[PDB]
Structures are given as structure tokens and as C-alpha cells.
Symmetry: D2
Subunit: 389 residues, 4 copies
């Protein structure tokens, strides 16, 4: 009876949610600027009696949607994403993610009055990163994920597969501050912020010999001075660093901090060096929770492929350090589909992409059913995760 | 006899008219090659006194040549008019005074020019502070415009009154590197790194400073150093000055900086561009007999001409001095503590002393032109001295 | 009806004569291209068994080719002898055993060679550890010395017994910069700075690392960086390595480093030299059917052939493997916890276990060559498989 | 007087004895702190004329103090003896002449010292060309050795005869980086790279040159930059000069270079050492009236004292000028085209003109000492001018 209601609702109303997906696809908004997308999803949740908190952990366009039955049972959380890319506009198919997670939440809410427990959608802006990007990183730090017990989600891809491993990433600004002087007449009175920057860059080049092969550090000079006749008192670069784990990355980023400090000391300058967004973490996978995903991926008619699909780089990792989380992919077209391409945006607004949205909503809604209904399958997952972390 | 008195009577009779022009250009500072109001205001005043006007000279829209010919034999006495402001500072070099002084000088001498013969010429010279397609006089020399005048006169407001200073040679240059972008994490091995090319160029310029002469300079900034942290740059852009005592010495220096760029390109597998954004300023060749003539009338008009080390300058009027006897002197507009390109200087350029400098300088120049036309021995001597010093 | 049995009877009856030779080479370590005792001791043993000797091969004074031809049609089976030690460690790679075992294996097969036809050849191969005019086998390949053999056999002592490993391509390079001196305080404007050129080269090499493949390496030191603080250096000298997975890839990587040097010279107005101080090592091309032959005899001789990731090597025997089917297998001389190029390894190259590994290797190689000559189908298949792969 | 004539008669009637001492030193050129033959040959001549000798001064084995004391009140007149040669060049600074002249001057004045009072002192000053524990006179000043003398006299052979030139302050510094080795192919990630530290220090010094005064210098070389290409270096070693107009300025400059090293260490994770390999050289404080006394006697002895710009020097005699009135003049030994530290200058320093200069300088210095002891008003005037000028 319980599975019937959830599927019936999603199947008779599919076109309504598919429509929300194209409406968001047509209006690509970048991270922390996704006003249309968050409102549209908030409305559908409010239309089905969800209690809405907006503006979460410093993210104006984030939300927490909640429907609580008032009965003991797990709080099953669905991660909604809805940010596009600059120039490419939804070439990661984030129109599907937010709509799929909302449709699944609302699908499950249909029976939550009966099974017990709670349903929650977390609207998570800026997953692609940037200034105050990676909202889920902020949520973990703010304690927003103490509100859920399990974090569900699906991502569109070139195939259907279980959660991939993911990497830790920092996005960092480097700034040097000196003292300007006319370069021809009195450069001996200057403290050269550009010499600091060049020296920092020489140092980062040298570092690459001595970091692990899985690690990355790359960046650009955003402000290199403005007048050729005047010694710069300010320069500004932006950098990424990347490691397999947060523990490893914290060590790696401190090495780069020290290259900046050293450059500062060489040149008599002062400096700032720090994150422009809360750091992204590696995924801690719960295999029994992906088993559950595969099971319903198959029951819904997808071939879940076992293969190396590479490493990801997503703030959903951060949520997996707190609670059992998934970040699987649903096929939305050719196996030659590559994320962040024009052909991938086209794919996210196609009939296959529309089908994946509905299949994703069904899969998640039915996992939520089994986690609240079953206490042995739920406890297996919770105990597995807490052992792996 | 009385031809000197007509010049002075004209200049002094309607001096306040010209002071107003100075103040109107001061209120509305315009940058190099953008001096629409200044050029037009000065062109209208020449046109009001029957000068034949040519506009848009040597690729400079806001440049002009204003000629009054008597139709009789004699020298062509040129007056250099400058009228560009500085960014954020707005006539902190007092160029409102220079253009107006030269116009008023030319028009003073114009009063008498039908009696004494020869020809008066105002050359409107924009963008002397430099920049993209800056230094109009450099373009003028190159285009043949300076063949129209026999002598080139000018005054420059300063912290004191002094004869022409030595000036330096300058190039202003763009360095651009061109590569092949790639995603930095995933596939940096199929990129050609234009920022690496730039850092290598910068490292090489630093090294070069050990091996250049102590009178030479090389300095610059990175205008484009990449835009996305996750993408390898395929384009970087820097802007540089190079300077030396002479144009001969500078062409050697700039070429060394060229090869530093080239080498950076070779190291990184990138391609490159390296060239001047403007024509290129030359060192002054001074004609001491011409500065003697200035000092003479500087004193007659009541200025104390100081003989001290007032440093080197760096002006496209040096380029004109390679063609014809040229002066680039200074007239006091206030405190000896006045430094050029400061807020105090801008305020000084609109004071009563700057207004007075303007009138005195016009008087000095008009009277030099009277004698250069009138006294053939004094003219011959200046022409021959200059010719010896360049030739 | 068994020529196999003569081979083993010879090696087994006078094995102690050969174990002596190994300990004599071991007591007297000689660095690459200085292996006077080793080369002569081995040459004297070959002369004792009717081998014809040519010495000084491909510009290597301590190299040789010992041939014994039956005069009958058949494959020329080559055995590689190595005999160079390391500075300070002195045979912590166990090259005392490699050269002895190959000479013993070739003399073992010589006992039967007049009957089965064909030819036995031993290539004395100095300086495999590398250095200046190092990697003798690289020179042999380039000199056409390997046209004289049809198959290249060898054994190396190791932490266990296994088949040929994959190896990597290496270049060993000199960078020299040539400028013009002047007094640094007084007239540095008349100088061309060979040290600024060097610093600029090093800065460029650092940048290169972001853009090379993860399996590749470039690393070096400054051997001459100027002598007087008050004189602008007119000369600087660095030594570098470059490494890739193939020789085709390494030629590209080394040329990138060539252009980094070249760019540095252009920046500073200096001149430059950039090139190898030794010929240059190549990736192994393995012939699995030849390693199979090894494993078959390895097991007949009592050894356990292990199949595991034993990592990558870097040896000039790879260069040989581009010309003819070649092996570079390992024979157990002690604990699995043995590491190459260490003090514990040198002691193991002269132990009872290392002695056993010599005779076992010598038997394995002699029997392999017996089969390569005798079995045309096995020979044909190994030659054709190598031919398809290269 | 009869005293003045005893002095000159001594120097003239056995000048060839001392010229031979100059040639034997020239024949056997010895580097700083290694001048065993020169110091001993000089010490033996002073021993012969009843001078008390102390050897090994302020940590310099080839240094000596040779004292002849009258036991009567009077100034203690110091004669600075130099005798170090250059590597590969022999005596291309003419130091063979310097020490012999000062010994012959000291001994000439010694003839009369028991009659006029006071004291004669020769300081044997090794390694003035510098290097490891170079510049003995820096060590002497620092050790209190110059409290033994009231005036310091000296002559230096040159292309002409002239008064003490201005001299510069110098530091010779070693830079060492300490890290942690690894196999470069395999384990680079557990290394700390002392060569990257050195490269980074050099890149930093290159950048500094834009920002040091035009009279300042910094230059060095890498003496150890690693030894095996397959191993990340755990040790590098460089040697540097820094230079400035004054010690006050040079300390600021040298500290800037220290911070460049510190920063390189911080970037690479290395440790470091930075410090001088010799006592630092200081700028000359000149006493004009002492040079006037030199010029007086130079002229008497047959020399033309030329007033002209002969550039800046760079010598540890400068250090002595901070304590007592000192001269560092030059005496002509050949063509005006002679340049120090060349083969021609070595050739000059053994020539007849060089021998003549030795005797003349000896005479000049001994006649200078006679007046300094004898004339209290000339002495006092020199002491009070030095005291004023040093501050
Ligand atoms: Zn994405
Ligand atoms: Zn995504
Ligand atoms: Zn367990
Ligand atoms: Zn200006
Ligand atoms: Zn101006
Ligand atoms: Zn080895
Ligand atoms: Zn080996
Ligand atoms: Zn010297
Ligand atoms: Zn000297």
C-alpha cells in the first residue's frame, strides 16, 4: 500500500515537475544568485504543506523545507541543487537535481503521516564553487545537517552508477600589500607587491616537485598592478589546492601559505592568504546505502554500471562526514556525455533527462520508505557509516 | 622701432581674455588624444585672429597646425601648444598654461608679422604625458610636420624659471603572450602556459637590471594575468617603460627586453608580441644660444633665471629638437617646493602666479620670435649651433 | 639421447670454480668503465673453454664479445655479463653474480654446441649502473653489436625469483652556459651572465613540472655556479636526469628541457650546450613467450616464480630488447625484505644463497638456450612475438 | 733641519737595499693571510733597526706590530704596511711597493725619533684585498690595535699622484641553506630542497636591485649547488658582496639581503645561515689638512698632485680613519692609463717608475711624521679636524 501511493503520486504528476525542470533550465542562475530556482522549488514544497526556513548559514538562496509527522523515526533528507555555470548555463544538469529531490521529498511526504519520522529538503546553492560557494560545506559547519539522519541525492551523468570517490578542495585568495613609488625616480622607497607575487609564483612552481602525484595547486593573477610607471602596492591572485583527503589538503594548503609568507618576507610586504569559501571535503561512502540505491535504480529500469567513473569534487562530500550520504549518477544520454559541456546542457533538457528526473525521484522516495519502515536496514547503514568515519 | 611695443601692448591689453581660456581648460581636464574642448577653444582663438587651421595631424584627431604667413621671406617661428591633463589629478602639470601661452605668444607676434616678414605657426600637440598613441610631437617629427617651422618655442610652468633641461629617451611597450588553454587539474600536459611565459619574462627583467647602465630604467605591470584559477591561461598582457640617456642607447636596451620576452616564449612553448604602444620619445639636443635668448627676455619680463641642477625631463619636445632649434624651459608658477604632478601643482597652475607665468611666457616667446625674424645674425648663429650639435 | 644432461653435469661438477670467480669479483668492486679485474677474470675463463675474444667494444675499454661458433646453421644465443659495482657500496646490486652466471651458462651450453649446431656468444657489458660513457649495452645497440646475437639471456639477483619487469627510458644530460665575465661592481654592463642563464633554466624546469605527465621526471643540480663573488660568471654547468615510460615520450620531454635551456640563453645573451653524457636508456619490450621459457626452467631448477608487481627498473638491457628477444628476470638470493643497492644486499650477493642463485641461473640460461636452438617452433614463436610487439 | 736631512740621507744613501725588498716580494706573490715571505722579509728589516716586534695580531698569523719608542712624550705615528697579492694576477695592485715604502718611511723617521720624541709604529696589515678572514685593518680597529697609534700614514701606487679618495663600505657574506635529501625520482615529497631555497634567494636578490640606491651593489655566486642529479640537495652554499656609501647604509642593505635568504628558507621549509666571512670594511672619513700635508711633501719630493675625480675606493684603511686621522693617497707609478688589478699594473709595480714611487712615498711619509711630532699646531689642527668630522 505504501509503495503504491508514493509511485502513483510521482507518476500522475510527473509532467508538472518536468515543467519546473525546464523552467529552471531556461533561467540559468549562478551560485548565490539563484533566486528564480529557489523560489520555484520553495513554492512547490509550500504547496504540499512543507515548513520552510530560508537563508541558511549565510546563503540567501538556500532553504530548509520540513514535513514532520510527529512520530519517532528517521529524518530523511533530500539535497536540492540549482546553480548553473557561467557561459554554459546548466551544463551540469542542476535543473534535474533540485527538481528530482523535491519531487522525491513530496512523493515520500504522501506516506510520512503513516510510516512515522520526517522528510526534509535542503536547498543548497553554489555547489560549483566560487566566493562563498559550496553551501553544503557551510551547512555542515553551521550544524544544519544535525536536522537530517540520511542525505539522499542524484546527479545526471553519462551512465547510472553508485557514488564515486571525491576529492578535498580549497579555493584561496592570495593578496600582497606594499608601498607605491614612482618606479623611475624613487623605487628605493617602495615595497613591491608585484615582486612579492612573482616570488610567490616561483615558489609554487618549485613546490610541485615535492607534492604527491594526486595533489594539485593552480592559480592566476587577478590584479598585477595598474600603472607601469608606479611600483604596485597591491597584487591579488586566486588559487585552488587539491588533495585526496582534507587532512592531506590542510597540510598542502599550509605549505602554499608558507610560500606566500616567505614571498612577503623577501620583499618587505604584508599579506593575506585564505579561503574564499568553506573548504570541500572527500566523500565517506556508505556501501549499504549505495546497495539500496542500486536496488531501486534496477527496480525502476536502469543498468547500474560497475566501472571507474573517475573522482568527483563536490561539497556533498562534506555532508557524508556527518551522515550516510549518496552522490550517484543517473544516465541522461550518450556514454560520451561529458560534464560541463554544451552537449550536456542539451542533454539535461531532453526526454532522457526528464526520465532520469522522475526515475531519480522514485528511487530516492523508495529508499526513504525503506529507511523509515525498516529499522534493521536503517541500523546497518548508520552503524556502517559511523564505523567508516 | 615700435614693433616690440605692439606685441607687448596687444598681450597686455587683452591678457585677461587669455587667462580665462587657461582657467576654462583647467576646469575641464581631458586626457591625451581626448582633448576636444581644449583643442577647439585654442583653435577658435587662432581662427579669430586669421590663422589658417589644419586639424588631425599625424594620426592625432585633437592635433592641429595653425599658420599665419605674411607672404614675405623670413623664418617660420613655431609655438608648441600642449593641453592634456593627468588621470585622477587633472592638470597637475599645468598644461592649461602651456597651450594658452603659446597661442597668445603666436597671436602677439602675429600682430607685427606682416611688417617684419616670415611666418607664425602654432602646433597643437596632444598627449605629451604619453600612453596609447601618445606623444604627438614624436608622430609629428616622423610625419614631416616639423619641416613647416624653422624654430620651436615653448614654456613649461615650474617651481622656478630656468633654461632647457636635458631630457631622456623613453619607449612604452606592450608584452603579450599567447598559448593554449587547458583545465589545470585534469589535463595541464596539453596546455601552453602564457602566465608561465609572463613570470619567466618578469624573472628575466629583474636579472637584467644588474647589467644595464645606472641612467637606464625598465619597469612594468601585469594587466592580464589570467581570469580563471582552474584554467591554464592562453593569454597574458603586461605594459612596460624603458628609458635611457639617448635613443641610440635605448634601442639597444629595448631590444634586450625584446629578447627576454622571446626567450620566455621559447621556454614555455608560447608565442609572443612585443612592441611600442606609442611613437617613442627622444633625448633633447639643446641649442644654448636659443636658451640665451629665452633667458634674455625672461629677465626683461622680470623673471630670475636660475642656474641649478633641475634634473632630467622626459618629453616628446626632445624629438622636435633633433629637427629644429627647440627650447623646453620653465617659468615659475609658485613656491620653489612645487613638485610636478601633485595636487599643489594643479592649484598652482590656476593661481595668480600661474596666470602671470602665462602672460610673461607669451611675452618672452613673442619677443624671441620678433628677434629671430629681425636679427639675421642671431638667427644664423642659433641655426648653425644646433646644426653643429646634432650634425 | 640427452644433450641436456651434459650441460647440467658440467655446471654441477665444477660449480665451485665459478663461485670462486664471483667472490673474487665481489671482494674487488670496480666502478663502471674501470672493471679491469672483472673483465679479465671472466675473459680468462672463456678463453679456457675455446671462446674467440674481441675486446674494446663501442668505445668501452672493459667490454668484450666472447664467441664460440659450431660452424653449423642455427641461432646465436647471447648471454649478457655485467660486472660493475657502486661507489661506496661496492656490489650492492650483485653484479658479481650476473657476469659469473652468464659466463657459466654460456660455457655450460658450449659443452653441447658442437652437436646441436648454432652459436654461443657472451657480451661483456660494462657500466650498467650508468654515469659518464655509461650503459654499455646502449652503445652496443647503436654500434650494431647486437646483430651478432639472436636472443639475449641474463639473470639478476633479487628479493625473489620472477620474470622480466617493465623498465623506463632515461636520459642523463649536461646543461652548460657560456657568457662573458666582467667585474660585478664596476662594469657588469659589459657582461653576459652565465649564472643568470642557469637560474633562468632552473626557474623554467620548475614551471615545466605542472605540464609533464605524472610518470615523467626531470631533476638536477648545479655543478659549477661561478667561482668569484666579484666576477660575473662566464660559465656554469648543471647535470640533469629525464625519465619517461617510453623512448618516444622521453625524446619529447628532453627536447622541452632543451628549449628551456635555449630560452634561458636567449634571455641572457649567453650561449649554451645541452646534451647527453651517456647514450641513453630505453624501455623494455618484453617477449612473454621467452619469460615463459625462463619460468619453465626456473621451476625445473627448484625456484618458485612469483607473479606480483615488482615495480619498474631502469637498465640498458631494455635497449637490447628493442633489437632481439631479451630477458631481465630476477633470481632469489635471500629474504623478500631485501632491498637493492643496500649493505644487506652486497652481503647476500656473496652468501651461500647468492652462490646457489648463480648456479641455478647458469643452469636456467644454458637449458633455455638448448631449447631455443633445438626447438624451431619455440624459437620461431618467440622471434615472431617479439617482432609483432616492437 | 739637520733632522729632515738625516731622514732623507738615510732613505737615499740606502734606497737600493729596499728596492730589492720590493722586487723579492713581487717575485713571490702571496695571497691574503698567506704572506709568510713578505711579512718575514719586512719584519727582518725592522728587527735590524731595533724595532720591537709583536706577531699575529687580531687573529691574523701574518700580521705584526713593529714599534720603535723614544720613551719621550710625542705623537705615535703609524705606517700601514700591505703585502698581499691577487690570485692569477700576482702583485697587480702594487702591494709590494706599499709595505716596503711604509717600512722604509718608518725606519727613516726612526733615525731622528730619539732626538724629536714620540714613537714610530708599523702595522703589518694582511689580506686587504679581502676574502675569508680578510681585511686585517678591520680586525685591528675592532681589536683595539689602533689605540697604539695617533696618525695612520700610507701610500698606494696609482696611475697618478692624488689625495685620499672617498671609499665605500663592503660586506662579504656566505649564504647556506640546509634541507633534507631524498631520491628525486621516487621520494621527492619527503625532501626539503636546499637548491630550491638557493634559486629562490637568487630570484629575490635580482628583484632587490630595482630598489637599492644607485651607489649600492649586491653580487654573488653559487659555490655548492648540489652534487648528485638523482638526489634532492640538503645543502647549498653561495658567497656574496654587498656595498654602500656608508656602513650605516650597508647594514640596512645587508639586512635586506638577509631577509631575502630568510624568506627563501621559509618558502622551501629549509633552515639557513647568513653572515660575514670577514670583518666588514667601512667608508673613509677624510682629514683634509692631513692630505694637505701629504700634498705639500709630494710636491717637494717631485710629484704633481692632481685634483680630479679618481673614483671611489674600497679598503679597510677606511676603518682606521674612523679612529685616527688617516690618509690613503696614490703615487704615480706609470701611465695615466694604468688600471689596478691588470697585468700592466703588476708590470708597473716592478718598474723603475714604481721603484722611484716607493722611495718618494717613503720620503713623503717620514717627512710627514717629522712635522706631526715637531709641529704641535699642525698636529693639533689635524686631530681636531678629524674629531669634528667624525662626529
Ligand atoms: Zn559541475
Ligand atoms: Zn553537478
Ligand atoms: Zn570493521
Ligand atoms: Zn607632466
Ligand atoms: Zn608637462
Ligand atoms: Zn643497480
Ligand atoms: Zn643491477
Ligand atoms: Zn687592490
Ligand atoms: Zn691596493
Amino acid at each position: 500500500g505504501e509503495k503504491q501511493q508514493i509511485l502513483d503520486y510521482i507518476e500522475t504528476n510527473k509532467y508538472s515537475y518536468i515543467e519546473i525542470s525546464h523552467r529552471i533550465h531556461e533561467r540559468p542562475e549562478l551560485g548565490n544568485e539563484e533566486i528564480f530556482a529557489s523560489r520555484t522549488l520553495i513554492d512547490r514544497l509550500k504547496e504540499h504543506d512543507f515548513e520552510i526556513e530560508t537563508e541558511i548559514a549565510g546563503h540567501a538562496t538556500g532553504f530548509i523545507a520540513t514535513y514532520d509527522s510527529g512520530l519517532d523515526g528517521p529524518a530523511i533528507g533530500f539535497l536540492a541543487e540549482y546553480d548553473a555555470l557561467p557561459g554554459l548555463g546548466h551544463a551540469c544538469g542542476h535543473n534535474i537535481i533540485g527538481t528530482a529531490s523535491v519531487l522525491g521529498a513530496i512523493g515520500l511526504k504522501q506516506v510520512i503521516d503513516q510510516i512515522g519520522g520526517k522528510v526534509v529538503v535542503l536547498g543548497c546553492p553554489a555547489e560549483e564553487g566560487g566566493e562563498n560557494g559550496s553551501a553544503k560545506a557551510s551547512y555542515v559547519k553551521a550544524g544544519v545537517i544535525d536536522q537530517i539522519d540520511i542525505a539522499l541525492m542524484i546527479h545526471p551523468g553519462n551512465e547510472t552508477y553508485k557514488t564515486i570517490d571525491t576529492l578535498a578542495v580549497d579555493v584561496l585568495d592570495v593578496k600582497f600589500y606594499g608601498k607605491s613609488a614612482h618606479a623611475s625616480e624613487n623605487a628605493d622607497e617602495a615595497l613591491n607587491a608585484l615582486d612579492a607575487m612573482i616570488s610567490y609564483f616561483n615558489g609554487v612552481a618549485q613546490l610541485r616537485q615535492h607534492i604527491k602525484k594526486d595533489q594539485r595547486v593552480h592559480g592566476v593573477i587577478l590584479d598585477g598592478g595598474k600603472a607601469a610607471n608606479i611600483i604596485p602596492d597591491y597584487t591579488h591572485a586566486r588559487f585552488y589546492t587539491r588533495a585526496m583527503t582534507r587532512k592531506e589538503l590542510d597540510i598542502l594548503t599550509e605549505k602554499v601559505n608558507q610560500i606566500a609568507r616567505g614571498a612577503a618576507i623577501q620583499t618587505g610586504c604584508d599579506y593575506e592568504f585564505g579561503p574564499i569559501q568553506n573548504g570541500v571535503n572527500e566523500f565517506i561512502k556508505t556501501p549499504k546505502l549505495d546497495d539500496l540505491f542500486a536496488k531501486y535504480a534496477e527496480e525502476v529500469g536502469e543498468a547500474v554500471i560497475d566501472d571507474d567513473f573517475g573522482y568527483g569534487s563536490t561539497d556533498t562530500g562534506n555532508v557524508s562526514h556527518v551522515v550516510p550520504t549518496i552522490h550517484p549518477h543517473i544516465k541522461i544520454g550518450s556514454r560520451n556525455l561529458v560534464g560541463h559541456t554544451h552537449r550536456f546542457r542539451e542533454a539535461a533538457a531532453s526526454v532522457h533527462g526528464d526520465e532520469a528526473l522522475i526515475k531519480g525521484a522514485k528511487i530516492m522516495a523508495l529508499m526513504g520508505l525503506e529507511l523509515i519502515t525498516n529499522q534493521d536496514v536503517y541500523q546497518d547503514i548508520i552503524e556502517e557509516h559511523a564505523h567508516l568515519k
